[PDB]
A and B are shown apart, each in its own frame.
Chain A
Amino acid sequence: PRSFLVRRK
Chain B
Amino acid sequence: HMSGVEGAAFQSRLPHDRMTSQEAACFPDIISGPQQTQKVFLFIRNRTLQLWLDNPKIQLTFEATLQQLEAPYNSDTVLVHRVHSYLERHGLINFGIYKRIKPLPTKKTGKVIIIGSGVSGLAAARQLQSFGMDVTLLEARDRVGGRVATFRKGNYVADLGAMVVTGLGGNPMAVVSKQVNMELAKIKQKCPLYEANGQAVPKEKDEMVEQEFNRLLEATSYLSHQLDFNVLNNKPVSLGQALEVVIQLQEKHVKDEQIEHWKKIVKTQEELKELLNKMVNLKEKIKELHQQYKEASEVKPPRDITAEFLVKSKHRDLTALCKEYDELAETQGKLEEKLQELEANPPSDVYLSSRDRQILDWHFANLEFANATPLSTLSLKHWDQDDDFEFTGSHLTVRNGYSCVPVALAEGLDIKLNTAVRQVRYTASGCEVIAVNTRSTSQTFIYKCDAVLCTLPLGVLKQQPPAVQFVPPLPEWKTSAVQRMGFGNLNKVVLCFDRVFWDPSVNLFGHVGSTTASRGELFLFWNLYKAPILLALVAGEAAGIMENISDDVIVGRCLAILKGIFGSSAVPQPKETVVSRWRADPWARGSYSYVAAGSSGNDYDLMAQPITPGPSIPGAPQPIPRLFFAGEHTIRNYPATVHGALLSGLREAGRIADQFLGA
Binding site for B on A (CB under 8 A): 1-9
Contact = CB atoms under 8 A, between A and B. Distances in A.
A7 B166 contact: no
Contacts of A1: 370-371, 383-384, 386, 594-595, 639-641
B394 to A, nearest CB: 11
Interface string B146-182: 0000000000000000001010000000000000000
B206 to A, nearest CB: 10
Contacts of B510: 6
List 9 A-B pairs, minimum CB-CB distance, nearest first.
A4-B370, A5-B370, A3-B166, A9-B214, A2-B384, A3-B390, A6-B366, A7-B191, A1-B640
B565 interface: no
Interface in B495-532: 508, 510, 524
A2 B210 contact: no
Contacts of B594: 1
Given A3-B370, A6-B366, 20 more contacts: A1-B383, A1-B386, A1-B594, A1-B640, A1-B641, A2-B370, A2-B386, A2-B387, A3-B166, A3-B390, A3-B391, A3-B641, A4-B371, A6-B508, A6-B510, A7-B189, A7-B191, A7-B210, A7-B366, A9-B214
A4 to B, nearest CB: 4
Nearest to A3: B166
Contacts, number: 46
Contacts of A5: 366-367, 369-370
B384 A6 contact: no
A4 B510 CA distance: 15
Nearest to B524: A6
Interface string B379-396: 000011011001100000
B369 A4 contact: yes
12 contacts: A1-B594, A1-B639, A2-B383, A2-B384, A3-B390, A4-B166, A5-B366, A6-B366, A6-B369, A7-B189, A7-B210, A9-B214
Contacts of A6: 191, 366, 369-370, 508, 510, 524
Contacts of B210: 7, 9
B305 to A, nearest CB: 90
Contacts of B387: 2
A5 to B, nearest CB: 4
Q: Which of A2, A3, A5, A9 has the most CB of B within 10 A?
A: A3
A2 to B, nearest CB: 5
Contacts of B386: 1-3
A4 B189 CA distance: 12
A7 B595 CA distance: 22
Nearest to B378: A1
Interface of B: 164, 166, 189, 191, 210, 214, 366-367, 369-371, 383-384, 386-387, 390-391, 508, 510, 524, 594-595, 639-641
B400 to A, nearest CB: 21
B198 to A, nearest CB: 20
A6 B387 CA distance: 15
A2 B189 CA distance: 15
A2 B390 contact: yes
Contacts of A3: 166, 370, 386, 390-391, 641
A4 B508 CA distance: 13
A8 B392 CA distance: 13
Contacts of A9: 210, 214
Contacts of A2: 370, 383-384, 386-387, 390
A8 B210 CA distance: 10
A1 B384 CA distance: 7
Contacts of B508: 6
A7 to B, nearest CB: 5
A3 B639 CA distance: 10
A5 B369 CA distance: 7
A5 B164 CA distance: 11
Contacts of B371: 1, 4
A9 B370 CA distance: 14
B390 A4 contact: no
Q: Which of A1, A7, A9 has the most CB of B within 10 A?
A: A1
B397 to A, nearest CB: 13
Nearest to B163: A4
Contacts of B640: 1, 4
A3 B369 CA distance: 11
A4 B166 CA distance: 7
Nearest to A9: B214
A8 B595 CA distance: 20
Contacts of A7: 189, 191, 210, 366
Q: Which of A4, A8, A9 has the most CB of B within 10 A?
A: A4
A4 B638 CA distance: 12
A4 B641 CA distance: 9
A2 B466 CA distance: 31
Contacts of B383: 1-2
A8 to B, nearest CB: 8
B193 to A, nearest CB: 9
B632 to A, nearest CB: 10
B519 to A, nearest CB: 14
Contacts of B639: 1
Nearest to B595: A1
B634 to A, nearest CB: 15
A1 to B, nearest CB: 6
